[PDB]
Amino acid sequence: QDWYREEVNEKLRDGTFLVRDTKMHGDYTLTNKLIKIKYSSVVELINHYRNESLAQYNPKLLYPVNIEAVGKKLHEYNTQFQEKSREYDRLYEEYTRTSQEIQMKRTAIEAFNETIKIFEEQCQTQERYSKEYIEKFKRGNEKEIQRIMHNYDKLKSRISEIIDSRRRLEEDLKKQAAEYREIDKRMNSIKPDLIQLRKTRDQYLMWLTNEW
Amino acid sequence: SYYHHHHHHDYDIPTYFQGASMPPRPSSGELWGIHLMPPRILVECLLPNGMIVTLECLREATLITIKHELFKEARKYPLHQLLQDESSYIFVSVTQEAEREEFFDETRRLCDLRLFQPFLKVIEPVGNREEKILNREIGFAIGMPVCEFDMVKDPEVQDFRRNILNVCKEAVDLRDLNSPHSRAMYVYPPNVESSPELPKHIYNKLDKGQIIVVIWVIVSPNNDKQKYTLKINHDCVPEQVIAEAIRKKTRSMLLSSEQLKLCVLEYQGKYILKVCGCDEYFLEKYPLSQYKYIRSCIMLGRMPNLMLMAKESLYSQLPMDCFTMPSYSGETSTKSLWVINSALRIKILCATYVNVNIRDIDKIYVRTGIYHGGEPLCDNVNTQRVPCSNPRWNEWLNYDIYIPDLPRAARLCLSICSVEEHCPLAWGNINLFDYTDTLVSGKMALNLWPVPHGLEDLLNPIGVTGSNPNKETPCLELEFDWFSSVVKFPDMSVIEEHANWSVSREAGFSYSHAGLSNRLARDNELRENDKEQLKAISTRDPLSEITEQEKDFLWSHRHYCVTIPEILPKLLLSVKWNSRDEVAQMYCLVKDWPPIKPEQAMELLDCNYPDPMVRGFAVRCLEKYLTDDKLSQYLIQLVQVLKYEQYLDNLLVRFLLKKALTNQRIGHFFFWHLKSEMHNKTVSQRFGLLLESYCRACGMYLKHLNRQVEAMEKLINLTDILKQEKKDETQKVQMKFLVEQMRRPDFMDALQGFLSPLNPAHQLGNLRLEECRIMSSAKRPLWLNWENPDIMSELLFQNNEIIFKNGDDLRQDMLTLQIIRIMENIWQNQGLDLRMLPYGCLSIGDCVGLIEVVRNSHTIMQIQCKGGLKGALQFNSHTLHQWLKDKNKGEIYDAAIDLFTRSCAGYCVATFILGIGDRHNSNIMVKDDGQLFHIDFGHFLDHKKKKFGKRERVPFVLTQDFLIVISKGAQECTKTREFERFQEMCYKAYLAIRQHANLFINLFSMMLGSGMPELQSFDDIAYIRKTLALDKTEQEALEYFMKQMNDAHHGGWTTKMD
Ligand SMILES: Nc1ccccc1CO
Question: Can you tell me where the transmembrane regions are (chain B)?
Fold first, then answer.
């Protein structure tokens, strides 16, 4: 008794091997690739393939991976892990919605730009047809042109606002893009320790073999 | 003393972690960055003369109204005489999707335009085909403008859009083949079970095969109706039924017998059968029983109500679909892949955007690998260079596989990792061949994807092929070896020849071989112990992985496997896809393999069968065997399975697209399942392109789908304002806001004339605002109620009410209800009556959806609050049973208990197997007539075992309450025969599913695509193996189920003959 499916694959998660147990089917199994198993023994055959490779049989097995005083440490490692998982679950939210919000800005910036161009074209459009009517007739005069001046004066100081408005958006894109990086930065720090906090919690529960 | 006086110094009492209850938002509404435009609004009207008159006009004003006033108020400004008549003009502006949209439909309202900035340029109509610039309709239905596609560089995309029309054109042909019938047949496909047989428990309800039906007619003016109650053979057809109605209607004292016969024949085929209260129609030769409305009536103890509708009044409604081709109407001499004599190598260069802490993380590398689902060589890395601070390689990774041994479907999968401190940063995969068969060569830019929630593993082959369309992400570029010529994958003629050669060459190999295993030496004549290990393997499920012996064993006897078609899925997973010898030979078996059942063939479109030949076979199966009934059951899975298809254009898409364009009921759910997932930018392009094809060719239903779409967007904005601005207000105050808004004309317009997306048969008329309300949940779901505007509403339901919920992600519920529905049909068609109520659910968006309201049903909790005595001390176990007796008095009682006990049995077995969220008194429901059903299922395959979890849980635990009811009134009722009867249902129910366990594996397998956290990879699906126990023998399983049912209940389950 004393290396010897679902919980086998979870122990192959991330050379590594182990041996498994219908009896009218086979007997033992070497798990990732599965090999069906004189066998003169179960411990005989495996020691031979630890040093050596599996090429010659078929066109290595390199990695054979306080009764009251470990019990509460199952609650402790779980309660940071489950705190740590929440932190990972929060940030992956923030990361994605910040990615979303970002591109809504990018699309708005494009919309702004197309808005602006129609207006640029509009102040361009009035010059062609207004400065026809400044030079025809002449003696309308100021009751005509100083109202055609008023219209135009609005037309550009509006465009001013629209470009102001676009800039003010563009700056926020940067600050958002900054925060986006920062989130990812910390995501990648939390991740590897989350795995180690998780991996020891498996080992701590596996040695023992639930208020915790 | 409580806390050892330990101060938590960080704890800031104001702010908040979303604890102190609604998930992902927001998408903007009527103007940029404002949900709901102010009732009176100022709009800059840019004229052709360059003038800006700023109108004030109401939020809900039409453009007919804004134009008509603008050409009155423009007069008062200068240059009036440089403007034509208003009728020579059309509005235009920039929308929130950032495109210059011209406004042809002048009846449209200012709020309904999605305007970005509040302004309107005036122009004369350019691009004289007005007609053609109703691609507005298409891009509205789709939720992105069609012009966004016209500007895509990629040739595959533009090739897809041109080549897919082949299909559309063929489909529109079939529709107008024998018109107007075939049109009606498209619009109103017959809603029909796939089996004309009748289970014995239904037949028995009929007194030797006869139903009483009621045919209805309308005369003058279009008001009064008349019944004509027949009693006919269950198995007689609509044309017979129409005759017998007409006979009865027109018998007389003035017509002889012979004279009746003649007046019937002239009338007989002038009419067709409608169902009363909805748009369902019995339009072809089928046993009345085989229509689902009929078979439902029989089970529900009801008397069908049909209507005699005149073919000319039905064909009056069906308009022409009149398909129009859009404006959008390999390479020469190449070198075969098989000529190339080198191993693969790939040059990895320069990741740029990599966001890592240099404190926390030590050093970082790029893992790589070639793949086929599972991989054809040793996985390798580059060295851990310029770690963190500006990561730069210029290596050549060398892959031990010759270039001719690359299978057609081969893919490079890569990922950037960190340091047994191993940890993946970003990922991305490329197809080694392109969509034109071309071996990839040169430099490629590949913008990467973030690791998902569950993904602990480091490389991600199941993840989508292609580069992230989001530019601002880890873009690592690279170089592919180039062989003086555009390399291509060989023709079929070539791959046949290599196979025929490779099999003759095998016959002359001599005697023994060391690990001879992979070839016989046994001869054409094979051992009988061999032939019974093969059919033994054949039976095993998809997830029971095969050993290398069994693989080679299968692979040797590959030719006998043509005896057992059903073995194919296993056979294929034994082929070494890194040996073109083997693979070429496989291509020739698969070429002319015997077609198999559709439920077997759907495995072959999961992520583990990427080959095109294989997937083509599977589609050929579906083309032959899979029926429009059975297709539309599994449609969710067939749309999810598209995501694993290497290239845009393929056989699977062309099939689905055609069925969608051929049968409007499929089309309808085909639209919504694609549309549903348009927010997810893995699939946005693919699904968009597909939705464009569908929308272009589906005819008049587009206009209908636009109304549904227009209605949901209104509701999405409504719930968004309630969940953001009007939180921290009283329900009282919120509900004023709701009513006030629905009253406004634009909402009245948008929410009244349309079809339920949960079922487009149901028309939704005027909404009754008296009965509309915001439910008490924190997600602020809307209870919505519409008149049923059908001619004979009263015969089915006068009011139609369904729930719209902005918060939750509906797609797990959606899937479990599908799985229940399937278990019901499995059971029921084996004569095993267990009555599940798979209520309607539809995801239409990013955590948006629709739930069918089941009337006359109550959460156990309500039952108990209603029947609870005052001086609120303790609730009664019997209260449930009391309430149920109160509903069902007399002979009625015994039948109500039967129902309860039958439904309680199915929902026990169903729920245990699926592992759904723990059941309690506010997610279990009982109807007045005594049927029990679960709601709000939660995470399905046991997703709260990712915390701490082999729990093998029992979610539906039968408290006293239920047991009392199960056994009439008995005391300590574990021991009644009532309950023995019950347990027997549970045992025969458990087993009946266990014999179909493959399908359930496969249905879950095909869903891995969807970004559902509960289904990240196959081990998730491996829960369902333990709980169905497929490693065990059926008698062991029965006991395992008995055992599990015993331990959760504490006593009951150890007496049956298994
Ligand atoms: N062999 C294989 C293939 C696909 C997914 C998972 C596995 C086993 O880890």
Answer: none
